[PDB]
Amino acid sequence: LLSFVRDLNQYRADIKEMGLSLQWLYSARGDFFRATSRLTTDFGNAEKTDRFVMKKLNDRVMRVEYHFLSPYVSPKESPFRHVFWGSGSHTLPALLENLKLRKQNNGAFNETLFRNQLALATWTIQGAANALSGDVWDIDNE
Amino acid sequence: RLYWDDLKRKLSEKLDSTDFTSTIKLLNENSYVPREAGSQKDENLALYVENQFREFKLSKVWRDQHFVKIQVKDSAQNSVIIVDKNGRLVYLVENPGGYVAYSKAATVTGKLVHANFGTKKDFEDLYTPVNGSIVIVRAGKITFAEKVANAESLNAIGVLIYMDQTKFPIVNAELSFFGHAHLGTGDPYTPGFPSFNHTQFPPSRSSGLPNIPVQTISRAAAEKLFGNMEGDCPSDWKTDSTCRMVTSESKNVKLTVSNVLKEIKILNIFGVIKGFVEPDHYVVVGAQRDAWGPGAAKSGVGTALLLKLAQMFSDMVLKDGFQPSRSIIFASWSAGDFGSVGATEWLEGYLSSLHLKAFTYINLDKAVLGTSNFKVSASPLLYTLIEKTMQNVKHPVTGQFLYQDSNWASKVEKLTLDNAAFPFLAYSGIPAVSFCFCEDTDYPYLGTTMDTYKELIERIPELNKVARAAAEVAGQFVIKLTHDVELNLDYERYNSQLLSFVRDLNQYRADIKEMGLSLQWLYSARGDFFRATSRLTTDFGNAEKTDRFVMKKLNDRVMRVEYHFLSPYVSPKESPFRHVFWGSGSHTLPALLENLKLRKQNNGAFNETLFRNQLALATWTIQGAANALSGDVWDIDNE
Amino acid sequence: DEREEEQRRRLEEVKEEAKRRERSEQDLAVLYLEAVNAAVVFVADSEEEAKRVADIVKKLVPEVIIFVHDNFVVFVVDSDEAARRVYEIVERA
Ligand SMILES: *[C@@H]1O[C@H](CO)[C@@H](O[C@@H]2O[C@H](CO)[C@@H](O[C@@H]3O[C@H](CO)[C@@H](O)[C@H](O)[C@@H]3O)[C@H](O)[C@H]2NC(C)=O)[C@H](O)[C@H]1NC(C)=O
Numbered sequence: 018l019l020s021f022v023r024d025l026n027q028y029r030a031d032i033k034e035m036g037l038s039l040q041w042l043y044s045a046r047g048d049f050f051r052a053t054s055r056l057t058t059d060f061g062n063a064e065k066t067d068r069f070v071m072k073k074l075n076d077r078v079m080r081v082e083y084h085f086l087s088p089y090v091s092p093k094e095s096p097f098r099h100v101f102w103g104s105g106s107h108t109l110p111a112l113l114e115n116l117k118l119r120k121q122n123n124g125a126f127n128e129t130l131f132r133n134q135l136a137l138a139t140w141t142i143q144g145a146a147n148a149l150s151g152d153v154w155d156i157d158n159e
Numbered sequence: 160r161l162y163w164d165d166l167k168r169k170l171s172e173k174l175d176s177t178d179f180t181s182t183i184k185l186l187n188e189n190s191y192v193p194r195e196a197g198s199q200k201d202e203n204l205a206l207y208v209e210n211q212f213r214e215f216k217l218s219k220v221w222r223d224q225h226f227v228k229i230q231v232k233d234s235a236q237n238s239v240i241i242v243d244k245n246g247r248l249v250y251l252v253e254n255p256g257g258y259v260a261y262s263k264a265a266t267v268t269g270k271l272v273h274a275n276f277g278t279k280k281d282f283e284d285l286y287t288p289v290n291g292s293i294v295i296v297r298a299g300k301i302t303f304a305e306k307v308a309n310a311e312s313l314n315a316i317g318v319l320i321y322m323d324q325t326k327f328p329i330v331n332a333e334l335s336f337f338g339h340a341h342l343g344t345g346d347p348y349t350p351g352f353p354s355f356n357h358t359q360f361p362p363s364r365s366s367g368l369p370n371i372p373v374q375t376i377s378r379a380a381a382e383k384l385f386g387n388m389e390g391d392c393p394s395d396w397k398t399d400s401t402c403r404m405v406t407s408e409s410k411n412v413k414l415t416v417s418n419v420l421k422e423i424k425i426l427n428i429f430g431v432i433k434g435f436v437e438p439d440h441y442v443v444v445g446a447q448r449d450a451w452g453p454g455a456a457k458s459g460v461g462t463a464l465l466l467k468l469a470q471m472f473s474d475m476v477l478k479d480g481f482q483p484s485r486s487i488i489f490a491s492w493s494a495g496d497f498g499s500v501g502a503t504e505w506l507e508g509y510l511s512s513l514h515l516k517a518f519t520y521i522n523l524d525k526a527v528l529g530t531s532n533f534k535v536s537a538s539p540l541l542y543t544l545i546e547k548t549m550q551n552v553k554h555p556v557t558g559q560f561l562y563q564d565s566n567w568a569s570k571v572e573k574l575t576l577d578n579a580a581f582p583f584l585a586y587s588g589i590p591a592v593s594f595c596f597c598e599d600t601d602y603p604y605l606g607t608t609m610d611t612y613k614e615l616i617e618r619i620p621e622l623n624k625v626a627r628a629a630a631e632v633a634g635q636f637v638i639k640l641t642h643d644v645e646l647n648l649d650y651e652r653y654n655s656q657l658l659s660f661v662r663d664l665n666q667y668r669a670d671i672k673e674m675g676l677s678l679q680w681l682y683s684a685r686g687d688f689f690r691a692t693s694r695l696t697t698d699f700g701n702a703e704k705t706d707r708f709v710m711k712k713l714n715d716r717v718m719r720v721e722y723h724f725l726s727p728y729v730s731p732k733e734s735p736f737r738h739v740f741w742g743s744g745s746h747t748l749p750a751l752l753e754n755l756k757l758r759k760q761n762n763g764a765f766n767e768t769l770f771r772n773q774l775a776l777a778t779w780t781i782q783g784a785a786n787a788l789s790g791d792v793w794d795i796d797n798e
Numbered sequence: 799d800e801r802e803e804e805q806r807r808r809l810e811e812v813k814e815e816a817k818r819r820e821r822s823e824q825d826l827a828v829l830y831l832e833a834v835n836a837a838v839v840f841v842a843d844s845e846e847e848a849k850r851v852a853d854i855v856k857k858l859v860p861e862v863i864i865f866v867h868d869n870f871v872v873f874v875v876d877s878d879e880a881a882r883r884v885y886e887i888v889e890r891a
Pocket residue numbers: 269288289290291292
């Protein structure tokens with residue numbers, strides 16, 4: 018995630034000229050870091066002989082890769098839904114290339130597509146962080 | 160240790176000592192009415208519900224903040240005018256006080272053609288075509304959005320909606336009313352993704368937003384319009400004698416709608432009672448808080464039921480030793496009048512957290528509208544739970560059990576777009592249930608300024624007792640879903656559903672045979688699903704209920720049943736209602752049946768390649784659900 | 799070549815804006831109706847017919863407020879009853 022936002026830094030002005038902000042990406046990054054740190058802490062404080070606490074924590078672990086599959090894309094027409102390692106306009110590299118087309122001032126840049134990409138990627142990351150953080154009522158979002 | 164009988168008896172004991180009418184009357188005080196979505200009184204009622212949840216000492220009380228776009232009236236008044244095509248006279252029919260949210264702002268002029276209810280069959284059996292003309296329809300059978308969509312499908316330029324006296328015996332003929340015409344749920348400008356600031360609100364419009372103006376009019380305005388129209392309305396429509404069909408040659412109608420979008424902040428209030436064994440799995444109980452007018456029946460009854468259920472269950476857990484295995488979430492939604500916006504956006508925001516965790520939703524909206532009938536619409540997985548509940552809960556008036564028809568399950572109507580349980584079932588794959596004590600007619604004051612406490616207590620003098628019966632039904636649902644190690648979710652029910660499907664296919668067998676296709680794979684999938692359900696029931700019977708690990712495996716397999724009927728081949732953003740049984744779109748079984756129906760009509764409306772793909776994807780959805788229910792991947796048998 | 803382009807587009811703009819201010823008599827009648835929330839706006843062929851129809855309406859509906867303007871007649875009422883009566887009279891007389 019850090020690398021992702023760093024790849025965004027080279028386009029600050031673009032993000033600034035479209036009236037957009039990167040604050041929500043940093044907040045989602047913080048939430049994901051918090052979720053991973055507490056998951057490691059829970060693994061450390063749990064007893065490995067307790068089959069059920071370990072099962073719950075391992076289920077939370079097994080949901081990590083699944084939550085990076087884009088939930089806003091058709092799996093039939095774009096099967097490679099992983100926003101990190103897939104292909105299509107739903108991936109972070111596609112967002113970066115579309116944003117790249119705004120500096121190189123041709124008419125290839127699609128602003129509405131970029132806004133939708135940013136929204137969907139931001140909430141994919143935030144939802145992965147929320148799901149990793151625990152129960153739905155224990156999400157500290159405001 | 161308390162068992163089911165002890166919990167039932169204590170629940171009934173607490174229901175006897177509960178005063179629902181006082182809270183209903185409190186929700187109709189001037190500090191809470193009217194409570195349009197995002198208004199100050201909506202926030203006041205939200206704060207009251209939050210403080211009540213805190214005072215009940217629930218396990219945790221929290222809130223969700225959303226910024227959604229609704230539509231409100233503009234300073235420019237919407238108008239319905241009659242113009243003479245000679246140009247010599249114009250006549251203001253009405254400046255309506257109500258409006259239809261999400262209507263397009265436009266001015267259109269043309270003939271006025273009467274459609275009975277706006278259904279597709281009403282349009283097909285019509286003498287006068289509606290293309291290029293304004294359509295006037297009665298409300299009552301389908302949502303406003305469905306009427307407007309059916310009108311747009313035939314190139315109508317406008318829609319007028321009124322309440323006839325036969326369907327709505329209202330003395331006040333000038334009563335205004337309100338609705339919305341968005342063919343969908345949630346914020347129509349954030350289709351498929353939560354209405355949170357994190358998204359920075361990109362430009363995206365739901366495909367269900369209409370492109371023609373639609374306006375609600377009073378019955379007096381409808382009769383004034385009929386005064387300028389010809390032709391008697393059909394007898395089977397069963398409407399007023401003043402009804403007419405088409406405008407005269409000399410008269411046209413001008414409809415002007417100028418509603419404006421408005422961004423508002425809505426609050427969703429939540430309280431949670433944590434479980435004692437598996438607190439990560441939970442039931443959700445929700446109720447709409449907002450309303451255009453006073454919304455006593457539309458919002459007050461449901462909110463009072465939510466408050467009372469939360470209070471009673473908190474008292475049972477804290478004082479009566481009730482130890483639910485799973486958690487219970489009580490939710491007060493907002494912006495429900497605009498298409499269950501709060502609940503839909505909550506689902507879209509926390510889908511990743513609700514996945515295989517929220518296993519049942521119980522809606523409380525409009526649960527008390529009458530006393531004659533007890534009606535229910537739910538996923539089949541809850542049917543058994545409903546039956547057992549109807550067999551021991553007594554009718555508030557007659558005193559008999561609600562279970563009087565043994566064939567009730569074959570007459571259940573599926574959840575509709577206007578019900579808050581519909582996005583829970585069709586989009587997120589959570590088994591949902593809605594129920595109501597109602598009449599054969601519709602409650603006439605829904606969406607009007609006459610939906611007050613006085614009218615409700617006058618139509619239903621036994622309001623306290625009926626509210627108690629509805630709360631008993633909901634509480635027995637919650638107890639059965641949270642108290643035992645078994646979930647009381649009946650997967651075997653879906654077998655029946657599948658049978659109906661293939662039977663509905665039989666009337667098109669010849670078509671299936673001339674396209675070179677077979678139904679043999681569907682029957683094999685039915686056999687696989689039936690055997691899987693039988694094996695699961697046998698495993699539940701042979702298992703030890705104290706062995707938490709075997710029960711955990713079997714219950715996880717149970718909790719995946721509703722999710723596996725969500726179509727995995729469609730985009731959840733553009734087709735959110737993915738459930739092949741209860742959703743909408745070309746991926747559902749009813750859509751397959753309608754497309755197949757078009758093959759008899761030998762015109763080019765039938766789409767063969769679309770039908771072949773529909774059949775393939777539905778067949779493999781059913782087969783994959785059966786395979787997933789059968790067990791491990793290596794234990795799947797293939798011919 | 800670009801001078802001819804700007805000349806062409808300026809003439810096209812003038813055409814569009816000239817076509818957009820095209821009013822009908824019914825448009826002015828509807829503006830009269832919507833301005834004061836009138837019930838009926840009647841466009842006569844002459845001021846005499848306007849006066850005669852207005853006087854007939856005033857005789858049958860005394861409470862109506864009548865605004866006679868060239869050959870246009872604007873009927874403002876206080877109740878829907880008077881609106882219906884005025885409309886029937888103007889449409890059938
Ligand atoms: C509703 O749809 C109908 C059907 O398209 C529309 O009526 C159609 O109007 C056009 C032009 O007004 C007609 O075109 C003429 O058709 C005659 C047919 O004999 C042809 O000889 C002429 O050369 C010309 O093409 C068309 O026929 C007519 N259709 C019918 C069945 O009468 C109607 O206008 C639509 N409603 C509205 C309000 O626009």
